[PDB]
Tab-separated table of C-alpha atoms (C1' of nucleotides) and ligand atoms in Angstrom:
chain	number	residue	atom	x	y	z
A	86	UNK	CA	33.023	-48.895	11.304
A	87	UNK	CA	36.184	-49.552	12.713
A	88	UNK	CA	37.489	-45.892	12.294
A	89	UNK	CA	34.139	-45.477	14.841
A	90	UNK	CA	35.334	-48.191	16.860
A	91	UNK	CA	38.485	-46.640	17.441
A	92	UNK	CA	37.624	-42.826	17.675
A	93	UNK	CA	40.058	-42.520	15.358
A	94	UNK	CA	39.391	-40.736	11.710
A	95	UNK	CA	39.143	-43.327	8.525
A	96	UNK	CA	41.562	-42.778	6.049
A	97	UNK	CA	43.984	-42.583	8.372
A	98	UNK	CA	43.289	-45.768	9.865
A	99	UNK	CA	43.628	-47.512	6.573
A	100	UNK	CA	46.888	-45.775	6.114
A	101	UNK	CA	48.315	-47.193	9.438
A	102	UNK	CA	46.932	-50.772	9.063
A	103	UNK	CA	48.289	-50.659	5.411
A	104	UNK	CA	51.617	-49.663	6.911
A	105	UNK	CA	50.912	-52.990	9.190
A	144	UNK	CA	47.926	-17.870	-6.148
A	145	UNK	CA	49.643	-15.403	-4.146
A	146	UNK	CA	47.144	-12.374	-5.089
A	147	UNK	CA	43.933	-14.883	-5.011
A	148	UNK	CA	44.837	-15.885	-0.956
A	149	UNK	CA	45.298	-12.058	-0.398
A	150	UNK	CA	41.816	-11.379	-2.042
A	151	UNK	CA	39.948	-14.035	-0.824
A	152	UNK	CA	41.831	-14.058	2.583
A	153	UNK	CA	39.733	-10.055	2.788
A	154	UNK	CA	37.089	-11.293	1.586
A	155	UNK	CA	37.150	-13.769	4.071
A	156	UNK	CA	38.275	-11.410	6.865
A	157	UNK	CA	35.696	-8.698	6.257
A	158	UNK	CA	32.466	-11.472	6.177
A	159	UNK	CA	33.660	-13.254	9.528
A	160	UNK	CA	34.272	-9.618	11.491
A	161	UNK	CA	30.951	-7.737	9.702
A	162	UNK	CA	27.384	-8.873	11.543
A	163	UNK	CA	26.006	-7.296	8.766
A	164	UNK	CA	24.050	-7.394	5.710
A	165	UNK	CA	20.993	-5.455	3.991
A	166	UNK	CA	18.864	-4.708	7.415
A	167	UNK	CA	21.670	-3.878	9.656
A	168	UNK	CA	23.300	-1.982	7.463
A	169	UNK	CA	20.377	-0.214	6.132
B	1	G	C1'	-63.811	27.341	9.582
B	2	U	C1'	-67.382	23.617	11.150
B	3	U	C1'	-71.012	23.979	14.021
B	4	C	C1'	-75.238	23.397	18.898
B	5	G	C1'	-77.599	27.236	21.678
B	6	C	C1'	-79.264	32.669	23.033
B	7	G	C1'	-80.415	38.238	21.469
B	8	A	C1'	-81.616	41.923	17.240
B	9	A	C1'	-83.030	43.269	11.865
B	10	G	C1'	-85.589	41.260	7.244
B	11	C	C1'	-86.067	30.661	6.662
B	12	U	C1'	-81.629	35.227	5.258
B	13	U	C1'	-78.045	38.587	7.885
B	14	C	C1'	-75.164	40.741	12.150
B	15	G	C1'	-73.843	40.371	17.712
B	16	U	C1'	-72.640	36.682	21.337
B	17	G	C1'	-71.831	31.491	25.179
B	18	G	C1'	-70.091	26.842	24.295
B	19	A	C1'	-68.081	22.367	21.796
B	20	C	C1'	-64.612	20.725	18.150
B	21	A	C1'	-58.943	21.235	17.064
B	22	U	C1'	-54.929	22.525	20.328
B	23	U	C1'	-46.893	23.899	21.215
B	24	U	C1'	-43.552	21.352	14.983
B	25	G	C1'	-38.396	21.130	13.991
B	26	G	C1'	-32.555	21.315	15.205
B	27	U	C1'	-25.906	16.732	18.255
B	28	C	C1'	-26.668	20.057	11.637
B	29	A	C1'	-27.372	26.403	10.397
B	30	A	C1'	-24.818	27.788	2.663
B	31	U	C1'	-16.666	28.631	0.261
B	32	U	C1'	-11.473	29.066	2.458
B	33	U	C1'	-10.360	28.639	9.387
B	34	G	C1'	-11.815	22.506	12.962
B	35	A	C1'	-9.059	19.060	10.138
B	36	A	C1'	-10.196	12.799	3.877
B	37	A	C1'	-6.948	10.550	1.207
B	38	C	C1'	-4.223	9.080	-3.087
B	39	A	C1'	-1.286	11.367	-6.656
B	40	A	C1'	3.076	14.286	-8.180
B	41	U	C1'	8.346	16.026	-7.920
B	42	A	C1'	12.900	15.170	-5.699
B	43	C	C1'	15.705	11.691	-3.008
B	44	A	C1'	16.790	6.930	-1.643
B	45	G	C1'	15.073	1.849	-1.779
B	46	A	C1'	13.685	-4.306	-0.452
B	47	G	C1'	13.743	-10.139	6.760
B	48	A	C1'	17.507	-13.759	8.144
B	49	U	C1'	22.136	-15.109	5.330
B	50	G	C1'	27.573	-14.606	1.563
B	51	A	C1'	23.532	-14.228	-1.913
B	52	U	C1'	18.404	-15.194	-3.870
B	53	C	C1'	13.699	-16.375	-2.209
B	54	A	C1'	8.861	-18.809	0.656
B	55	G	C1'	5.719	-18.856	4.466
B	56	C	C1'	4.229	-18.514	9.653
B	57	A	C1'	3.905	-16.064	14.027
B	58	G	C1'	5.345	-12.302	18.120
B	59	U	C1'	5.248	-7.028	20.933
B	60	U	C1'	2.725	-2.403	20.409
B	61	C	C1'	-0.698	4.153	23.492
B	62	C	C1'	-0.051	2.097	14.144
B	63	C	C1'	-3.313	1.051	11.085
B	64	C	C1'	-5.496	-0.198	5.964
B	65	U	C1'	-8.222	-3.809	2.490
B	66	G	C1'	-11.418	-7.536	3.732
B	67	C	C1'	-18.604	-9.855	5.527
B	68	A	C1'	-15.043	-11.927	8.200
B	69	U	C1'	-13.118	-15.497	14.179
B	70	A	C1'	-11.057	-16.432	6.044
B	71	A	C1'	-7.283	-14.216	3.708
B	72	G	C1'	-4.226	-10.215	2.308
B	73	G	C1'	-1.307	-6.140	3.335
B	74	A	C1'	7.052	-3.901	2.154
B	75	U	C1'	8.348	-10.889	6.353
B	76	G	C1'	1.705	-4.962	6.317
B	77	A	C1'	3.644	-0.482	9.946
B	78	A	C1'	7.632	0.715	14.411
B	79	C	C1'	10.905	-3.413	16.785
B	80	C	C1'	17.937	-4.186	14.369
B	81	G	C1'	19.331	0.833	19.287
B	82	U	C1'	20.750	1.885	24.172
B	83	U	C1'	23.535	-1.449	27.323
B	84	U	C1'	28.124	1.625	34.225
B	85	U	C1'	24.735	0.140	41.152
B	86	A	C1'	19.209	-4.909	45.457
B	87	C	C1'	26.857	-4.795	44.778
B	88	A	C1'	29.497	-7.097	48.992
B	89	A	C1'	34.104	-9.761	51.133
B	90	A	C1'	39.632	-10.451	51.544
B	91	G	C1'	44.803	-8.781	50.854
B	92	A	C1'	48.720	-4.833	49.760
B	93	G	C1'	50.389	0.428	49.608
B	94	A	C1'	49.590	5.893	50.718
B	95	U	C1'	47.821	11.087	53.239
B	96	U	C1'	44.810	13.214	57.567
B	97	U	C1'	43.508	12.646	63.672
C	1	MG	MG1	6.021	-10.996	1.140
RNA sequence: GUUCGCGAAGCUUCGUGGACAUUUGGUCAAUUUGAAACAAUACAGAGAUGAUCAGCAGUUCCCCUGCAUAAGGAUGAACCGUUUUACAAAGAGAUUU
């Protein structure tokens, strides 16, 4: 509620008032790459 | 043929005038060439979305099944692509008269 109050995120706020591998990312980074660019799937394709 | 009359031969038989009854059927003609479809082989193959799947519609000079204004057909079929002008106004530079 008072995260809303503020327009500020939550966890953050709490921290404040408190106060007072390698081949996987390049696979997954194509994987990633070719979904975003493609507008594709079966019908478009087809 | 039925018969109701006339005229000849022996009620029986020929020859006649009438009356009765009167125009069917085909948009077609019997095997390839006036248009049936499935099936089969081969080849691919399943709406969004990352994937899997439901259902509903929509457009059409596409239909099918269905008694159907039910319902169902690959989301039933094809739609997913191509896409440059009622086109003017302002500024700068260049060649021709
Ligand atoms: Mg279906």
């Amino acid at each position: 509620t008072i995260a809303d109050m503020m327009a500020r995120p939550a966890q953050v706020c709490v921290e404040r008032y408190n106060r007072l591998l390698e081949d996987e990312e390049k696979e997954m980074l194509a994987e990633a790459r070719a979904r975003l660019l493609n507008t594709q799937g079966k019908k478009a394709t087809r």
